[PDB]
Design a protein around this ligand. Structure first.
Ligand SMILES: Cc1cc2nc3c(=O)[nH]c(=O)nc-3n(C[C@H](O)[C@H](O)[C@H](O)COP(=O)(O)O)c2cc1C
Length: 357
């Protein structure tokens, strides 16, 4: 009888429970986009998680899309992250870094030399983007040259190697939520005619090349991949998600990864006519550990673990507001309510001051 509190062997790591802290952008980086002691407190408070996945962290300057998100490209950023991984480990936890490149979800004001954001195809996102001068229309991104794709892969590889020097236990590739890798995956955002567009094998090529590079830095059992098959976030949608994401799930098996992590969009059932990509399809296709996420509770999480539908369950919103979420779930305690107005930016309030039981 396994449940949310059962231990799990994740490669060489013993996880004390099946509860994962999902990656959560909090936009509280310091000067130079460097993590600092307040960030270390925040993650240290949550070290009872079976595994923490740290917030999306840009692997290279062009991969930033929102003010004040941390990076993992500079020595100062490695040193600030070391504060965080030191604290997590002192508190008996385990933490992977989520490696990010936003692709077209950015603005020139956030890019080096005021350049265009890069993408598979020159398609401006709809709406507005936050900059250091407030909100502005998105611009049309530049479509990467075929010859530039090795440089993207190398930026992810270096980001991964910097994460290893920062003392993380592993890394998660952010291939979800309409960021650069997802922009290549999905046919709504990828109109390319080279070997990185068209057929699914081509649209998955960036993800597979990034994963191969990262597994040359980390033991593969310390490398995870996140997908979000039915999100519509950031204007990024695929016309045949079952075929696209089922293919990806199988194609990742060669790498013997730590896990596949599925963010199950909250509106999937009500949007369209029903869920077009049952997570069970991906569970059957991917031969390793599966993390599921999206609206979980004690009762939903226990159910998926008991019936072999997933191995780990990640919680986002509840970990914002409940630093001791595992303890609270275990004893059916009250749960603190998350305050969205302090999700992003700021200081201790809405970050490290949510109370423990
Ligand atoms: C404030 C906030 C920030 C987020 N930042 C990230 C991120 O950095 N990386 C990511 O992959 N997902 C991110 N997400 C999505 C969450 O990881 C999670 O998948 C989503 O909130 C659904 O899970 P939940 O219902 O348990 O909150 C974020 C969500 C929230 C609420």
């Amino acid at each position: 009888n396994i449940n949310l509190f059962s231990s799990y062997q994740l490669g060489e790591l013993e996880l004390p429970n099946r509860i994962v802290m999902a990656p959560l952008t909090r936009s509280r980086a310091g000067e130079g986009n460097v993590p600092h002691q307040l960030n270390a407190i925040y993650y240290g408070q949550r070290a009872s998680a079976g595994l923490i996945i740290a917030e999306a962290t840009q692997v290279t300057p062009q991969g930033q899309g929102y003010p004040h998100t941390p990076g993992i490209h500079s020595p100062e950023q490695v040193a600030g992250w070391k504060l965080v991984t030191d604290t997590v480990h002192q508190q008996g936890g385990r933490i992977f870094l989520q490696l990010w490149h936003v692709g077209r979800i950015s603005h020139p004001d956030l890019q080096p030399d005021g350049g265009l954001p890069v993408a598979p195809s020159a398609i401006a996102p709809k709406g507005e983007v936050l900059t250091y001068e407030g909100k502005k229309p998105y611009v049309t991104p530049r479509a990467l040259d075929t010859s530039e794709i090795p440089a993207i892969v190398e930026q992810y590889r270096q980001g991964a190697a910097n994460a290893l020097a920062a003392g993380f236990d592993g890394v998660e590739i952010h291939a979800a939520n309409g960021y650069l890798i997802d922009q290549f995956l999905r046919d709504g955002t990828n109109k390319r005619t080279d070997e990185y567009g068209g057929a699914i094998e081509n649209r998955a090529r960036l993800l597979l090349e990034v994963t191969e590079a990262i597994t040359s830095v980390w033991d593969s059992q310390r490398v995870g991949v996140r997908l979000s098959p039915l999100t519509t976030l950031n204007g990024c949608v695929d016309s045949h998600p079952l075929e696209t994401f089922g293919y990806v799930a199988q194609a990742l098996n060669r790498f013997n990864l730590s896990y596949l992590h599925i963010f199950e969009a909250i509106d999937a059932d009500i949007r369209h006519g029903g869920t077009v990509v049952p997570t069970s399809h991906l569970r059957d296709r991917f031969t390793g550990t599966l993390i599921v996420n999206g609206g979980y509770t004690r009762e939903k999480g226990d159910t998926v673990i008991a019936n072999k539908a997933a191995d780990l369950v990640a919680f986002g919103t509840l970990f914002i507001s409940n630093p001791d979420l595992p303890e609270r779930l275990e004893v059916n305690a009250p749960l603190n309510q998350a305050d969205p107005t302090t999700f992003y930016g700021g200081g201790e309030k809405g970050y490290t001051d949510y109370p423990f039981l």
